[PDB]
């Protein structure tokens, strides 16, 4: 027992290094993913609601909005200030219900103007708590994704590409198995990655971001007891389509059933996966001395601490976005309240995705290359060259080949190619191509394909 | 210790319930997931290999071939026989190398042809094996989901939906939080599910499955040695996409990276999650007695022993799926081994979901409703019709609402209702449409969302 | 784009729920998992180290220390300030290395007195990094398991104890497949929780914590090198198992390999998942109106949201304990840097896990019996008294059995019950005790094994 | 679409690889784990019921059976037959329901004699068919854990201490971020396997495998009704503990919960973990040249291809086992069926674990070092004497001991050095051992830490 007393949240004393050692990368967020960010989503949505009922004209018991009503009501919206959430917080110590806050802090700013006052009772009209729940978390992911984490994601793509074109010429020994295999470019091998990482990039930015607001059960019930001759359903999909500017989910019920959300985190998954990936083929290709990696001032210790930062903490983004995916879809009967937990942790699996990026992007920074390593290992490797004189022998038809080839690799040198290629029945031009092949110069198209990417 | 003399295999000896007690549900995976299958379609791509060389006026070596060359060869690729795989398998006790053995069973059969035994050494011409095992396993994967999986997903579909429109106008009590709550239609809940399976089924259906034919390392480093004037690039494409109907992956290593694979099983894994909680959902009614199920003659016991297999199944089906999407795309450099025996168990995560899939649709054919028990829950349920009430009073800004429905509430009846109606300040044509009112009755518009799914 | 100015952190701002909208429930992981905590540990290894080399007669340049200088150092180790960790933050800044800038402040500190200055080149004499690290991770997962974990999910086994043993005797219908089976009491399947929890109880506090202290690699090269005549294995073990009170782990590399933080975690997640089960049980018997939950005034919904919480949060927990318990123990050969930044969320599982024992236990704390409604569904069910009678029958050989059971069941009444039992060639005193039989008598010893738990 | 007439099953035909590429490694599983295994199990346990009945005093109407009548019993419980296993599928195609099955199977060889046709209704007597599956799974796991997977397991721990022995004096270059770090031997780091290794089995053979026979629900609530003077818990517990060798659960519902089997697959899986980290730093020292492998005769490429096997399979095991362990314990109410299709591949991660296991075996046995490259790279890093200096700099005080050593590291050689210790205010003792040192010399004390594992 070595006991503590209590202490005060801070960036030092935070449980969860995302608002911890990390806080520096992930404070994008907070405005975002927070309780601060759902409640300020919240806000907004409800906000727009109200504002789209004072313009439906099959509502005339809200009356369109005068210029200084809509000031304030975007100023909630647009504008949202840490004060209401923090009355939000305290009503809510009353209520024990979260979103019946949001309601009442509302109530609270319209009584300030007679105007607001008089459609106090139209504020969350018919709705359910879930309906104002699932679009703000459809605003908040829509915000993280195409603001935060998709810029990383091209940041990345991009810095790659860049190594990819100067390198691209540079030849490298191949390693399969871990084991010296043809030659290839380091250009071409982290052109592979940027292909592999933009495909995903695709899926992660089409995603549709689902929306649905439609009463306690799906049914849009209490909307119709009320108002018999609106087209709830028409509102419906213009709101969340031309107000907020999300896709529409028809069939619900008291939830949106959140596989939008596991098609997202299944596509970020897979990003980190390659970066995984990436991540570990470059902390071997600094173990093998082709990278070098710069150094700061002051720093001690080179390592590639940034690339295994990067490493650890998508694994962590990745089980996250598993779970979330797994389990968020399934739900007893028309809801149960386990995702309302869950879903506070949307940006956890974001902000240990964007740590990672942060710190790949700085492993990447970092690199220099080693020519006189990379060069090295494939002079000392001439044992590659079996394979291009064994594809000629094959074209040429020449005999006894297993028996023939043998003879050279019993082994391969520059001199005892010259000597070889002389003894084949090929043609003269055969002969040029052989003559000229280095272990350096057996690289195949990968230039091209590497400056293309 | 309780000793046991060894066994041969058949489906009671199986230890995977894939081949053993399910081997029923699971067979037609048999010619396309199996080493037998994977030796079928690495066969089949040998073959198409070699004709696409024939056909190449840059192989001048390789000839167009006669219609008994080409018959010969169509019979391998078409008409595979068992014989040869054991032949393979016979091979491959002496290189401890399955394509290899694929390339030697070939030379034999080319043997047996002049025309063929003159071109053997270009089977296999400048591929590496995993030039064919890449297309062999897209080719699998596009069988196995084309004929097999999507079939038995669209049956799922259209046997919810033919009872979502039958029963579209059956009014339920709802429950969140396992509470009463607004009504719905048993033909909406169900309707519901529709739509998210049709939504993956898309999904599942749009993934483009890639292929490469690129040599050791990705970069056609033996067939540009001997053969420096073809493009390979565009005979690559044009072989992937034209003759074998796959897409294209223009930048990999030694193996495919495999990403489109975790696409295609996170996304089948969505749809398994939805079936997850449709068999949950239904096990519910079932519970409550709002479905009850057929039997068959002579069967011993009725309980959903049908959905609760579906359920079981469809977890494992998805700790494989995603297990494979985790791991298969990290390969270290250009590449490693491990994904080719994990890649033998494309065919369990779908065999486990065929036959959670059949189990759901013998459950789904059993159901039958119980109307008395439905309609006893929600005439029991006169509480659900404070809701639409309150609504009403707050559409006409009746005074003191909380107080007022409190008077109502502390509780509701028919007669109560009529009572307490009459004493509210709203219109007349308020009060005609709320005297109406019944808890069967107060379903919103889910028979109308429910009949046009 | 709905852009945002930068938010300081705050519960309300924090990304994370576990700092954030939880952080009440968390504040006492605080002084343990956060980077403060780490480097409590840090600071307080160190010390300890620093005062078994002045203790240890084999290392004559560290003389025994002063009792002024004992006090220092012991207030560094046992009265820890959070100005010393900010300062540690702040030479970090230069260093870039966290455990280096935790040198280096005690360096500063030991420059006061000059007793101290004279070995200030001792302090983390021959030590690697993760010497002070490993001690640091157990000695906080110590303090966690021992002081926060433990107690609470004892708490959870006593009270749902208390109810076993209050409930031991309340008949109730059990229900397999969801459908009606042999009754039980409440209180046996409360009981039936108690004694799986426990087991796991057992498990996670028999968890060995191991720690090392060997240097860089795991053989003591740099402390040989300097005192070759001392014997390292046996300081080492005296620190860590006398003066910190841990395990020894006498075969490491760099890095203790952490196999016991996953025998922890999945010791844990054992629980959690026992505790999951009784989360979605319990919720399904207020479901059924078994329970009733008691009421907050001025709380406004009765829905189960606690247990809802907790087992949302579990899922979480338990996704984070799976993902450190497969990665921690896999690391590049004598160690690679990705466990240190996951090691920074081993905090984050308990908090999700005591989250959930919070809710738990706040959920039990609330549950009433409603014995109307569990009663109401075992009197309605006579046909549970089939399996006695056959049971009866089976004993005395009555003839044809199924043809004679079925006259009964074509159904089973209290009244059929009667006229049926005389029918049967059994004897009197068989007769005697089947006519006693009533659904709720049927319950088997259910109610001596739930008052013994 | 290339569609296939159907086939039947062999391991060519097999959709799972368990039971077709690997047949050969997992056939011990066949007698255990199979539909026949479970058959097998289900009829022991209903033999040794009916015989621990005839032996019950208290059950008159069994009476001790004659050596004929046991006879009969025991070749059943002890030599089973195919042909029992195939009628009790026949009978299935009837009953839908596999115990059944069993029973009925049991009454027609009972019918056969006399004196077990006399007491065929004791067949079963009062059991639900939960008390026979959970004492097969429980024999299941017994026979699979001790006779298959233990000896495997021990023969990976012995096999690596042998080498961990034979090298133990083969100083090697440690690699710490995949950077040259302070040296140890080869033997070391394997010993450092072994130790974690046969933790783990320990754990694995320590696992108590649970068993419970108590009827419908938990409560042997038909036994006390047909025999309530008998006791039921003690006759139990002597079955369970002293007839079948295994551990008592006296807290059941229908089902015994299952948690042992996650206990025990925890167990298996954090061994798997500890393999695949050995599978991959053994990968990596063939990627350094530092072990060669042996090659067999014909066998066509040396690649590390067992244990890139191994290490593809243990990840299937593991992703297995963390599905089973996570899922079986949940169970709704007095339970649901979804485990029993889930039990049905207890086998098959032991089946991934044991292709594992024989394949590490075999790359284990193709090791053999490669001297010269261990020595090269060790000879080339006099860098890793700069530890030792600076820390015999420290005991004795050297002043400026930055500035100092950095004198050497701008650098370090066998001739630099021999001059800068003499430049040192250190002692002649001291001098005597800095100038023997070179970085093979620099183990600490490896050698002896790995002679005595
Ligand atoms: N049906 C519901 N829909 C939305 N929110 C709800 C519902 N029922 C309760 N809540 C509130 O949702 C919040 C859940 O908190 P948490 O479990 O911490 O995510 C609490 O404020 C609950 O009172
Ligand atoms: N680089 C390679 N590409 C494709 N297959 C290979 C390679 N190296 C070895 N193999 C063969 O692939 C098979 C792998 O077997 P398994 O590990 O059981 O999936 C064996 O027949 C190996 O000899
Ligand atoms: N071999 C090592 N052992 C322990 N800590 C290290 C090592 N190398 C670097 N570090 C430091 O460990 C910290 C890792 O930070 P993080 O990746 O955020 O957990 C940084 O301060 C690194 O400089
Ligand atoms: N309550 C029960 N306990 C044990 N087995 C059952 C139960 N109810 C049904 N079964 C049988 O268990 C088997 C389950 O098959 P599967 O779902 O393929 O594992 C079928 O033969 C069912 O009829």
């Known amino acids: 027992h070595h006991h503590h007393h209590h202490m005060q949240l801070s960036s ?14 992930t404070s994008s967020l907070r405005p975002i993913f927070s309780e601060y960010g759902l409640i300020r989503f919240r806000v907004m949505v409800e906000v727009r609601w109200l504002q789209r009922l004072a313009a439906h004209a099959g509502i005339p018991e809200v009356a369109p909005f ?3 009503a809509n000031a304030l009501l975007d100023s909630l919206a647009s504008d949202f200030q840490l004060e209401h959430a923090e009355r939000i917080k305290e009503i809510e110590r009353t209520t024990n219900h979260d979103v019946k806050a949001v309601e009442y802090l509302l109530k609270e700013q319209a009584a300030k103007l007679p105007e607001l006052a008089a459609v106090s009772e139209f504020i969350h009209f018919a709705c359910t708590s879930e309906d104002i729940n699932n679009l703000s978390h459809a605003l908040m992911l829509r915000e993280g994704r195409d603001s935060v984490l998709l810029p990383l994601m091209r940041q990345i793509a991009e810095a790659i590409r860049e190594l990819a074109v100067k390198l691209a010429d540079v030849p490298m020994l191949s390693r399969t198995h ?12 982290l052109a592979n990655v940027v292909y592999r990482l933009e495909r995903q990039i695709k899926q992660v930015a089409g995603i549709e971001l689902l929306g649905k607001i439609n009463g306690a059960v799906g049914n849009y019930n209490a909307h119709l007891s009320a108002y018999p001759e609106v087209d709830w359903e028409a509102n419906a999909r213009q709101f969340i389509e031309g107000d907020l500017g999300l896709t529409f989910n028809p069939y619900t019920t008291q939830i949106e ?6 098609e997202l985190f299944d596509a970020i998954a897979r990003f980190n996966t390659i970066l995984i990936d990436f991540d570990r083929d470059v902390w071997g290709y600094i173990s093998l001395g082709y990278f ?3 150094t700061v001032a002051g720093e001690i210790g080179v390592n590639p601490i940034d690339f295994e930062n990067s490493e650890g903490n998508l694994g962590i983004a990745n089980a996250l976005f598993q779970h979330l995916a797994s389990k968020l879809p399934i739900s007893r009967w028309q809801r149960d309240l386990t995702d309302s937990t869950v879903l506070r942790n949307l940006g956890v699996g974001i902000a240990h995705s964007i740590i990672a990026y942060e710190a790949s992007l700085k492993g990447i920074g970092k690199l220099e290359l080693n020519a006189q390593r990379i060069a090295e290992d494939l002079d000392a490797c001439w044992e590659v060259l079996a394979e291009p004189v064994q594809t000629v022998m094959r074209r040429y038809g020449v005999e006894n080949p297993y028996e023939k080839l043998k003879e050279l690799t019993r082994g391969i040198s520059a ?8 003894e084949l029945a090929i043609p003269a031009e055969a002969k040029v191509e052989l003559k000229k092949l280095t272990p350096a110069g057996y690289v195949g ?4 394909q590497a400056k293309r990417i």
């Open 415 to 422: 001199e005892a190619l010259q000597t070889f290629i002389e």
């Open 257 to 262: 059933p959140h596989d939008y959300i596991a």
């Open 66 to 68: 005068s210029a200084e």
């Open 12 to 25: 030092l004393t935070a449980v969860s290094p995302v608002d911890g050692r990390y806080a520096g990368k």
């Open 445 to 448: 198209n990968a230039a091209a």
């Open 292 to 294: 070098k990696q710069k």
């Open 178 to 189: 871990g084991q010296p295999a043809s030659p290839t470019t380091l250009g071409k091998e």
